């Protein structure tokens, strides 16, 4: 009753692949993460954001049209790209059919944001109607949207002018959505404008002594608030820099290719050393002492990933990527919420009102591990 067996376990080219969960357990959790963000509400109306022009506006519920959506909507685009998922790609068609049925929500750096999964849907569909959306939103944030000095686009969100200041998610929120409409209707413009932005968001944002990037810049003053390498604001630059690479898919050896490259790197290399046992990174980045916080972690390990993957950066930063997910599905409870999550949080005046943010489950923090969940999934082909 003896077998005929091939040794290949001790050849690190013939062994196969060591996996932590299976693709199916992984995609069914990625459906159960998608499942809790799109129902989560504020039924008692709670958080109602309230402006004294009589504006009230749901920040928790699907129904509502926040960042949060934007990111979310993406995550949930990304793992239809992949998969074909039909169910998916239903829950994205129609949150825009009942927003757009709504009516706009006014123009802003985080309103923008769903702008991005639009653009893909419109490349795939051609559905006429998307268009004017796409037109109309670009258009502001060409010549409308506020601009600090050196043409830096300003933070200037719902409630808040934010005058003269340059925030890390800019990027992510106005920018990429820019850049990929830039594209998708042939404005050269748009995708030149895009790349000014990342020059300067990096000009004043980006911290020399460490690779990591402070929070916020202010023209007015010449300063970065609280000098705060925050973790989930570190996070957006990490995701967005090699989404926008392989947006402008630009030539090896383009200074500008490379200097973002190098950018991303330096970030890299900061962040593989701060990283805790557990694979998450702390809400300060470089305070062992400030508590370890997962959407970062999330947001990280989608950047690491997808840079590992285009090859910008070395395989070796795998390891990395691989110790945050592992880190990332320990943090997901049964109902599908990322646990150790951060309350959100504004520009901050000192560090310790970094350390101080409560933790609670949040939309973005579903949304960030979609993402990174969905890109983890890449390394299954």
């Known amino acids: 009753n003896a077998m005929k067996v091939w040794p290949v376990k001790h050849s690190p080219l013939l062994r196969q692949p060591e996996r932590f969960i299976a693709r199916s357990e992984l995609q069914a959790l990625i459906r159960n993460v998608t499942q809790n963000l799109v129902n989560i509400k504020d039924e008692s109306g709670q958080f109602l954001l309230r402006l004294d022009d009589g504006r009230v506006i749901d920040t928790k519920g699907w129904a509502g049209w926040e960042w949060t959506h934007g990111v979310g909507l993406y995550g949930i685009y990304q793992y239809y790209q992949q998969t074909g998922d039909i169910e998916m790609r239903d829950i994205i068609d129609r949150w825009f059919a009942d927003r757009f049925a709504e009516g706009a929500t006014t123009k802003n750096v985080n309103t923008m944001a769903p702008f991005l999964t639009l653009a893909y849907r419109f490349e795939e569909t051609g559905r006429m109607a998307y268009l004017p959306w796409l037109e109309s939103w670009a258009e502001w944030a060409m010549h409308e949207m506020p601009r600090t000095e050196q043409g830096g686009m300003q933070h200037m969100t719902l409630a808040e002018e934010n005058h003269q200041q340059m925030w890390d998610d800019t990027l ?45 810049w202010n023209y007015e003053g010449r300063h970065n608030f609280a000098r705060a390498r925050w973790a989930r604001g570190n996070s ?19 200074a500008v290719r490379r200097y973002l490259i190098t950018v991303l790197d330096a970030q890299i290399a900061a962040l593989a050393e701060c990283q805790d046992d557990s694979g998450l990174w702390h809400t300060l980045l470089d305070d062992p002492h400030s508590y370890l916080e997962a959407s970062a972690t999330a947001g990280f390990a989608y950047g690491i990933l997808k840079a590992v993957r285009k090859r910008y950066v070395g395989q070796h930063y795998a390891g990395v990527a691989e110790k945050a997910i592992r880190g990332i599905v320990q943090n997901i409870s049964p109902q599908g919420e990322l646990l150790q999550t951060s309350f959100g949080t504004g520009m901050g005046s000192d560090l310790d009102f970094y350390r101080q943010i409560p933790l609670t489950s949040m939309p973005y923090g579903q949304a960030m591990a979609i993402l990174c969940l969905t890109e983890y999934l890449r390394k299954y082909f």
């Open 172 to 216: 992510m929120m106005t920018v990429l959505p820019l850049a990929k409409i830039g594209k998708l209707l042939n404005r050269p413009q748009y995708v030149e404008e895009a790349t000014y932005q990342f020059l300067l968001h990096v000009q004043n944002l980006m911290d020399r002594e460490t690779g990591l990037w402070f929070h916020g």
């Open 236 to 254: 957006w630059l990490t995701m967005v820099i090699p989404d926008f690479l392989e947006l402008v898919d630009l030539p090896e050896g383009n």
